Subunit: 234 residues, 2 copies
């Protein structure tokens, strides 16, 4: 069934740069269980770190719960992303991960994986780079939350999704918003009605076409202009 | 002169868990050059990744420059912190690092270090945990920027500095703000006058004493209450 040797996201997931034998060795330890249902949690905050989770297909959201019980989303993960890097420093998950649609996950036992990386230097370096890239994306999200207005925040979110789907071999132009608009506003710090009005405006300028949960980008230059700008003085 | 064997922050820096021989091996590759002056940059965005930087003493700030030329700070680094993790994924620094006071830095050549970690599993695991902890702190900063008001943001910033200085063996009670208040507001998304009024209020409740750049915490319980709360409805 599911194996890394026959995976289209291998170049963006954990087996990147591994040759055939290294790839066989890596794939042996990975486990594929029943599909993750929508709303099902991969782990809860405080759970013992057992395995990392790669996303064969679907959408995952990472979030924490404030002292007052409010959910705050910290990341959306697409196919090829690895979830659970924040759990290594203390062998315990400090966050929640929840599927937003029916999703296939690859469970990678962390201690066995780390034992393997001590024997496969390419895998070690790829793990390093993936953690570094998560750090980089978190820094970019910090800049988004600090310097971008509502228009710029939503544009950056949409451009980021477009480029990631394009990296995963999908259409760079049309893609589905698998997360609710409430979750988008939670992640960007906006209201749902603010998101709806911004989408209306984006469609009015013909930059986007919105049809249900499907987004069509018609002017990537204008979208990237709004996404790479921080023009809000405040 | 400067060696990891005679370093008080060894348990919080990179040589953690290394025995005597492993520690000798690690220390051999690390280089100590002239001290970093205030305002001097360790690297610029786009510089080739040559070495990571550990902080033997002083204060560093990481920041990026927006398309409109504005600086946005993403982190402050104290003694024992490692700077340059975001540069691994592409062997190139995506950010700037600048000293806020006279600082001593340990230059760790990254390729030699990664070659060593392929031979010393404890060091490999410690590098993993440090990157994981940077991810965790970035997630916490995202939550700060998303859910906390000005009062809560400043309280969390001050409590975080207090706990980190306490981890480094310093006073948990009194500490110096080596970064300017403008840089604090940049990092937290606040105005300098907002910061000054918040400090006035914190001093009015006797929770803090402010004297120049020195902060004295008198009620850690109240400070942690404000720091761990996200009570702003908006
Ligand atoms: S998603 Fe699963 S099968 Fe595909 S490359 Fe990643 S670990 Fe391998
Ligand atoms: S600051 Fe320098 S000397 Fe001290 S533990 Fe870190 S690398 Fe070693």
């Amino acid at each position: 069934a599911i194996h890394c040797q026959d995976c289209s996201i291998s170049q963006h997931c954990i087996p990147f740069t591994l040759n055939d034998s290294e790839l066989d060795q890596l794939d042996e330890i990975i486990e594929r269980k029943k599909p993750i249902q929508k709303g099902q949690e991969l782990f809860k905050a405080g759970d013992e770190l057992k395995c990392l989770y790669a996303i064969r297909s679907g959408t995952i959201k990472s979030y924490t719960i404030t002292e007052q019980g409010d959910e705050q989303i910290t990341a959306f993960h697409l196919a090829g992303d690895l979830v659970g890097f924040d759990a290594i420093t203390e062998a315990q998950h400090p966050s929640f991960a929840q599927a937003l649609e029916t999703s296939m996950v690859c469970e990678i036992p962390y201690e066995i994986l780390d034992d393997l990386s001590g024997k496969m230097p390419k895998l070690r370096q790829q793990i390093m780079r993936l953690m570094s890239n998560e750090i980089k994306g978190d820094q970019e999200m910090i800049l988004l939350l600090s310097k971008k207005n509502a228009e710029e925040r939503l544009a950056a979110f949409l451009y980021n999704l477009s480029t990631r789907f394009h990296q995963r071999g999908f259409s760079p132009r049309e893609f589905r918003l698998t997360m609710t608009r409430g979750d988008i506003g939670n992640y960007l710090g906006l209201t749902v009605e603010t998101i709806s009005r911004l989408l209306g405006r984006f469609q009015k300028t013909e930059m986007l076409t919105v049809k249900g949960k499907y987004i069509t980008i018609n002017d990537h230059d204008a979208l990237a202009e709004l996404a790479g700008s921080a023009k809000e003085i405040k």
